[PDB]
Amino acid sequence: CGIVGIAGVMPVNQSIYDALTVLQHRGQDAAGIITIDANNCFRLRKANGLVSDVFEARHMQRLQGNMGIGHVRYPTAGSSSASEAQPFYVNSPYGITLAHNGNLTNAHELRKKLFEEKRRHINTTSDSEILLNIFASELDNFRHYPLEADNIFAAIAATNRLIRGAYACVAMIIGHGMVAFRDPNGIRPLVLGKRDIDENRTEYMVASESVALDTLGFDFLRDVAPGEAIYITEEGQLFTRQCADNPVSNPCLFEYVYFARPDSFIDKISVYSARVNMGTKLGEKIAREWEDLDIDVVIPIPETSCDIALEIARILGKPYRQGFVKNRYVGRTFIMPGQQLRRKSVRRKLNANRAEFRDKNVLLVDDSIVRGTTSEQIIEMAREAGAKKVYLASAAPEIRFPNVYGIDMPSATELIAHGREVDEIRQIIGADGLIFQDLNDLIDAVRAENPDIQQFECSVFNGVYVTKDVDQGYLDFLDTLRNDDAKAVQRQ
């Protein structure tokens, strides 16, 4: 998911729209934008589909005000295509709205706490609504008006003690301002920016990625620190505070692997550069370990893999050819009574340039291998195209565990790498040869861009969750959400 928040001195709707357009790659399932108009009332518009689908002229009209936050969703367990999208909001205390990217590992607990102690009803399965409510109830502990920045930081701190997992949020509070905070572990991305209009009138902005600041002409100030809370008042003043106890930087290694746009700088690290380095490391490993076999060309599997494979091709000193072209326009498949000769699912996504495979032992490069069904077919497609030997190289290490901090992944039992050795996986997908990026390699490659970061969040590879609170009782609860999501979507 991706979030944006702009506190400006002029109408923020188009900016929030444009900003979401460049964050669109973080979730195309749904989109929402909410602003505070001249009368101190929220103006909301959220629905499923791309940003362009969701917002029309009549919708932009009503999205009045000089401050608003936006969100683009990625379907997950607890928030399917059918569920209510973000941002959510409550009218008390004062009127709060919030959008978030990340996942609360103690969500269930919190829903219970909220009901028993605060009698606060959570109407959806979105942990975003829970988070908004915990935050809301904490602000309810201040009897006087208006609130002082500390109050808000107190609330935020309290919230950090109560919730667990990964999160990067932005929210607004009527009559006061806009706030944004990152989890104590700095797992989920969040950056701050500004844009001076004139003498003493700066507009501030926060977003999941730097590309949102760029596209709007905002000056990149810095990343929001782990456990830190930012608060911009309605008068344009920026305040900050450390709201966590033991803040640590354990950036999500996946953001760098393929989820984030390569022109983004996350925690002083360039996604593009990081990826190139991944090609260097993998290319070196391949030269070392696959010394004897004869590959004739390196072929990336769109999209992420392009620059990485190029680097590997360079290291291997072999030609790089664009063998697969991605079908940028994917249509809907209509269920019609007797779909005679259907189109191959894989071909729905990619197309193979026959000329690049004929009688060539090819080496395909992909950012990651999750299910393997896909992988198996891509390999199959290559053999169909005329490739003698088809070898696969993954830029990411074996994905063995599901992500519970913000990235939608299938259950541990669906991940083909879970409980399998490289050679088995190779046989299941039919690759003549398979090879993965070693985890420490991947780390060095990213860490090279910023040695200050000493540990990354990489549980999907090692099964080590920085928050420690992930268990099967919890993993199974996520599956209950997913099931209700599937019956809801199936119902539709």
Ligand X SMILES: Nc1ncnc2c1ncn2[C@@H]1O[C@H](COP(=O)(O)O)[C@@H](O)[C@H]1O
The residues that are catalytic are 1
Question: How far apart, in whole angstroms, are the C-alpha atoms of residue 270 and residue 264?
Answer: 6
Q: At what angle do helices 271-289 and 305-316 cross, to 10 degrees?
A: 40
Asked whether position 173 contacts ligand X by CB under 6 A, the answer is no
Asked if residues 178 and 5 have their Cβ atoms less than 8 Å apart, the reply is yes
Q: Which residue is nearest to ligand X (CB)?
A: 374
> Dihedral through CA 366, CA 369, CA 370, CA 372, nearest 10?
110
> Is there a binding annotation on residue 304?
yes
Report the nearest approach of a copy of itself to the CB of residue 31 (Å): 10
Compose the 266-305 pattern: x for residues touching ligand X by CB under 6 A, - for all others: -----------------------------------x--x-
Long-range contacts of 115-120 (CB under 8 A, 24+ apart): none
Asked whether position 369 contacts ligand X by CB under 6 A, the answer is yes
Asked whether position 15 contacts a copy of itself by CB under 8 A, the answer is yes
Asked whether position 202 contacts a copy of itself by CB under 8 A, the answer is no
Q: Which two tokens stand for residue 128?
A: 């975003």
Other Cβ atoms within 10 Å of 381 Cβ, number: 22
Closer by beta carbon to ligand X, 157 or else 378? 378
Compose the 156-195 pattern: x for residues touching a copy of itself by CB under 8 A, - for all others: ---------------------------------------x
61 by Cβ neighbours in 10 Å (0-12 / 13-18 / 19+) ranks as exposed
Asked whether position 38 contacts a copy of itself by CB under 8 A, the answer is no
Asked whether position 128 contacts ligand X by CB under 6 A, the answer is no
Residue count (the chain): 492
Q: Which two tokens stand for residue 391?
A: 């070898």
* Residues numbered 349-368 forming contacts with ligand X, rule: CB under 6 A: 366-368
Report the nearest approach of ligand X to the CB of residue 199 (Å): 37
Q: Residue 189: which of 252, 126, 274, 99 has the closest Cα?
A: 252
Closer by beta carbon to ligand X, 162 or else 429? 429
Q: Which two tokens stand for residue 258?
A: 């393929």
Asked if residues 226 and 248 have their Cβ atoms less than 8 Å apart, the reply is yes
Q: Which two tokens stand for residue 59?
A: 């919708």
> Is there a binding annotation on residue 183?
no
Asked whether position 103 contacts ligand X by CB under 6 A, the answer is no
- Residue 217 interface partner, choices ligand X, a copy of itself, none, CB cut-off 5-8 Å depending on type: a copy of itself
Asked whether position 30 contacts a copy of itself by CB under 8 A, the answer is no
Asked if residues 29 and 73 have their Cβ atoms less than 8 Å apart, the reply is yes
Q: How many residues bind a copy of itself (CB under 8 A)?
A: 63
Asked whether position 398 contacts ligand X by CB under 6 A, the answer is no
Contact residues for ligand X (CB under 6 A)? Answer: 258, 301, 304, 366-375, 408-409
